[PDB]
């Protein structure tokens with residue numbers, strides 16, 4: 001399965017997909033009691049749909065992704081309500097030592113009172129101390145659902161995400177944009193790369209006529 | 222894959238595609254404990270467990286796309302199910318064909334009426350023919366399609382694509398595969414259940430035994 | 441507020457929760473703040489609209505009572521992010537209420553048949569279909585079956601609860617020349633009520649987010 | 659109506675549209691009718707609940723203002739049929755407010771170390787994490803990056819707009835012993851407010867549709 005590594009321990013993996021560019025073509029044509037025609041006229045229809053705001057046909061293309069990301073990234077991601085999610089539980093699972101530790105280059109462009117290297121080390125210390133406490137609590141009999149409240153927001157979680165192409169394009173408009181947090185931007189770029197490979201016509205038409213973000217127009221795949 | 226079931230006099234329900242199966246739900250449920258699939262036996266058992274206890278989100282990862290031909294009055298009820306995607310034939314854009322649902326006398330099989338049931342079928346076909354001819358005359362005279370079609374009756378057939386996940390589909394079956402729903406849509410619901418059963422046997426059986434609230438599927 | 445539409449239709453406002461300030465407060469919570477001043481607050485609404493910050497507007501909710509022809513309702517009910525409760529032809533005996541277009545509805549079209557004749561032809565179908573409907577029910581045919589002979593111009597009634605964000609989507613799509621003329625009229629009524637209750641949001645919407653054309657011309 | 663929850667949290671009702679009669683009006687439209695009388699209207703609410711006619715309750719809408727720990731909010735925000743606007747760690751400097759469980763939270767569990775010490779250990783990490791956070795911010799580190807060291811018990815604040823149907827789903831799932839104790843407390847507060855504003859609906863809900871366990875015990 002296509003799997004793209006993100007951040008230091010994260011990833012985005014495509015699990016399954018239903019439909020393709022032609023699915024949208026057929027769904028649009030039913031309006032006129034028609035179906036598919038030719039690869040030329042059909043690709044042209046996708047462009048027409050995109051530039052005129054005919055979005056419902058794209059709801060028939062559905063993706064399911066497997067994602068590993070820090071909780072602070074997931075919190076933002078899960079705000080996209082038009083989708084389905086199933087996530088790893090801290091109430092039910094003993095948590096592993098997997099945290100997002102940003103490299104010094106994450107602070108590139110900002111003037112700091114201390115070396116970027118120090119910030120990275122400072123974050124690492126908090127992680128170590130918090131996880132150590134988490135383990136001490138669980139080993140002592142503290143219920144998992146309580147012990148985990150001391151763990152930081154950079155803890156990695158895992159989830160399945162099923163979303164249709166229309167909602168996915170909304171996600172890209174909002175997250176594959178410089179105003180979004182850099183960390184989720186990286187995930188949106190991976191999502192875009194997978195989208196591009198499975199629905200090339202839809203993706204191209206989207207970038208040329210509907211995309212309202214900036215990064216996908218300044219970054220290849 | 223593909224399956225097609227004929228409904229009423231000229232309708233049908235066709236499965237266009239499907240993403241996921243019973244194991245998709247098992248996997249989605251297991252992620253909670255950082256696990257995946259296990260064994261054929263423990264997995265089917267997990268499905269019954271999810272159904273029994275109301276853990277419904279794992280079933281959202283199973284998605285179906287159907288192609289349906291049904292009368293407008295049936296489609297009006299169907300389209301009230303908001304958690305789904307639809308694309309339908311348009312009377313504003315397309316010239317409409319002579320295709321209407323004419324109930325057989327058997328539709329009234331059980332009701333005592335003043336005039337013969339055969340008469341009812343005749344009366345309906347007559348009004349349908351009159352309305353359709355009027356529609357054609359208007360169209361032929363240059364009246365815009367969107368206006369000319371307002372004289373067409375509710376039994377006119379329409380066609381649409383329906384993409385829906387298993388969770389919403391189960392809600393649809395609870396409400397439509399039931400004696401309280403109109404008979405005509407009960408027929409379509411039975412076809413939908415028939416296809417659901419074929420593609421997700423474990424989920425369907427678990428649904429029927431522990432969560433299904435309707436009655437016709439248990440008969 | 442009630443506005444008459446078409447020949448027998450209407451749009452009536454039943455209830456409303458929130459106002460322009462509801463969106464301001466919802467927006468300010470991001471920075472752990474609330475309301476400020478009448479001037480700063482309106483500027484914020486414009487800011488939200490201009491930059492596509494739409495979620496704050498979901499906290500403003502409206503409930504309308506609408507009477508419209510079924511062909512109009514079919515299009516309206518395609519708007520899934522909303523709540524609906526409608527009159528039932530399965531349960532209620534239907535009244536003689538149909539939308540009959542006036543000749544003026546065909547202005548701009550050259551027809552082989554005089555516009556007035558079109559109105560008459562539609563009235564004819566309505567009368568014959570309704571009479572058939574009544575005859576069937578009086579004979580013993582269940583309502584849910586007898587009503588299938590009634591035309592798409594039959595009037596229905598429904599309650600519609602929708603938040604401002606979904607309402608703006610509705611206006612973008614229906615208060616537009618590409619939408620069927622009949623629903624455009626309802627959209628204009630909906631817009632008028634929206635403007636009355638949330639003038640800042642409505643004005644900002646028209647200036648920076650509205651994608652339709654008619655509200656710009658009317 | 660404001661109710662304190664946990665050590666520093668709360669649930670407050672901000673606004674509400676409709677009441678029990680809104681559902682009655684919405685339901686009766688099916689038979690082209692309106693309200694009747696107290697006795698008949700209360701009876702209809704029970705009938706709807708008993709037979710699963712849930713859409714009429716979507717016309718009752720509530721807006722709450724809630725302050726809860728992030729781990730509670732993560733569970734809460736999984737309820738998609740609702741609207742949310744929340745405090746942002748990317749844009750605002752975060753305050754020193756965390757949920758520190760009191761020793762009683764461990765009542766019933768067998769631990770090797772006194773419960774009071776568990777409370778003490780949690781406070782220690784919280785203190786260290788927050789200090790680290792402040793140190794980074796004052797050194798020029800962007801807020802969105804500095805906050806990643808903060809634990810899941812940090813309090814957040816949000817506005818929640820939800821209709822009665824979705825609210826009842828939330829109570830079925832959260833006002834239940836299988837839900838985390840912390841969110842059960844919030845659900846009990848939400849339930850109290852719901853009961854005060856829509857007593858007929860709440861009573862019918864508890865009698866015919868509620869699938870949880872605690873609301874039948876408390």
Ligand SMILES: Cc1cc2nc3c(=O)[nH]c(=O)nc-3n(C[C@H](O)[C@H](O)[C@H](O)COP(=O)(O)OP(=O)(O)OC[C@H]3O[C@@H](n4cnc5c(N)ncnc54)[C@H](O)[C@@H]3O)c2cc1C
Pocket residue numbers: 079080081082083167170174175179180181470495498521603605606609739740741742743744745746749
């Ligand atoms: C740069 C950035 C900064 C942000 N800052 C904050 C912040 O400070 N605080 C905060 O709380 N959130 C914040 N968010 C989250 C934001 O408010 C949305 O929750 C998030 O973008 C999900 O978007 P959505 O509503 O468009 O998508 P979805 O929830 O997936 O919805 C997709 C579409 O369906 C719609 N829709 C879905 N549900 C409803 C509904 N109930 N009513 C009306 N329309 C609906 C709309 O057309 C929507 O675009 C931020 C997001 C970004 C990208």
Ligand SMILES: Cc1cc2nc3c(=O)[nH]c(=O)nc-3n(C[C@H](O)[C@H](O)[C@H](O)COP(=O)(O)OP(=O)(O)OC[C@H]3O[C@@H](n4cnc5c(N)ncnc54)[C@H](O)[C@@H]3O)c2cc1C
Pocket residue numbers: 301302303304305389392396397401402403521522523524525526527528531688713716739821823824827
């Ligand atoms: C026998 C029968 C008689 C009926 N009679 C009438 C009638 O007289 N008048 C009439 O108007 N309708 C009538 N209906 C339609 C009914 O009101 C629903 O619109 C229809 O059943 C679709 O169901 P749903 O809301 O459960 O499904 P969906 O719209 O697909 O929703 C699925 C689930 O998501 C939910 N959900 C979706 N949207 C919202 C929302 N906005 N707020 C809260 N929860 C939401 C609920 O948990 C719901 O069960 C009837 C249906 C049946 C089966």
Ligand SMILES: Cc1cc2nc3c(=O)[nH]c(=O)nc-3n(C[C@H](O)[C@H](O)[C@H](O)COP(=O)(O)OP(=O)(O)OC[C@H]3O[C@@H](n4cnc5c(N)ncnc54)[C@H](O)[C@@H]3O)c2cc1C
Pocket residue numbers: 031056059082164166167170304305306307308309310311314518519520521522606609613614618619620
């Ligand atoms: C001029 C015109 C012509 C039309 N012609 C046709 C036709 O020929 N055939 C036909 O079938 N329909 C047709 N429609 C209906 C159209 O396909 C939509 O169903 C209708 O506009 C409702 O819009 P909506 O999806 O944006 O709104 P809502 O359903 O209210 O949704 C609002 C927002 O939430 C979203 N959203 C809701 N549900 C989902 C979902 N499941 N997946 C992804 N995003 C979602 C999107 O961001 C959306 O804009 C037409 C509409 C117009 C205005």
Ligand SMILES: Cc1cc2nc3c(=O)[nH]c(=O)nc-3n(C[C@H](O)[C@H](O)[C@H](O)COP(=O)(O)OP(=O)(O)OC[C@H]3O[C@@H](n4cnc5c(N)ncnc54)[C@H](O)[C@@H]3O)c2cc1C
Pocket residue numbers: 082083084085086087088089092253278281304386388389392736737738739740824827831832836837838
């Ligand atoms: C005790 C408990 C343990 C849990 N454990 C986990 C866990 O380990 N991992 C995890 O990921 N989650 C877990 N959850 C969250 C759970 O999976 C749901 O996300 C949460 O209960 C929100 O419920 P909901 O979907 O019913 O509500 P909403 O999202 O508010 O939806 C309300 C109704 O609309 C519906 N609906 C909304 N969207 C859709 C859709 N896309 N398709 C079909 N129907 C839809 C259904 O009828 C639904 O009941 C847990 C919840 C509880 C109460």
Ligand SMILES: O=c1ccn([C@H]2C[C@H](O)[C@@H](COP(=O)(O)O)O2)c(=O)[nH]1
Pocket residue numbers: 072075076077079179180181744745746747748749
């Ligand atoms: O870029 C952002 C900022 C905020 N939020 C939503 C996510 C959380 O629900 C809440 C606070 O997010 P943070 O700013 O703390 O990440 O608002 C996002 O979705 N994206």
Ligand SMILES: O=c1ccn([C@H]2C[C@H](O)[C@@H](COP(=O)(O)O)O2)c(=O)[nH]1
Pocket residue numbers: 294297298299301401402403526527528529530531
């Ligand atoms: O069994 C029913 C009855 C009604 N409705 C919804 C469909 C329409 O939006 C409106 C009226 O439907 P009819 O009763 O006329 O079919 O209410 C259904 O979905 N199913």
Ligand SMILES: O=c1ccn([C@H]2C[C@H](O)[C@@H](COP(=O)(O)O)O2)c(=O)[nH]1
Pocket residue numbers: 309310311312313314511514515516518618619620
């Ligand atoms: O302007 C339009 C045209 C179509 N449709 C949706 C409504 C129906 O579900 C179906 C066919 O509508 P008509 O074209 O027949 O009105 O497509 C709309 O919502 N608006």
Ligand SMILES: O=c1ccn([C@H]2C[C@H](O)[C@@H](COP(=O)(O)O)O2)c(=O)[nH]1
Pocket residue numbers: 087088089090091092729732733734736836837838
């Ligand atoms: O009782 C629970 C357990 C889990 N989850 C959802 C919330 C998060 O998205 C993810 C993990 O939650 P925790 O178990 O870590 O709280 O699953 C809930 O909504 N409620």
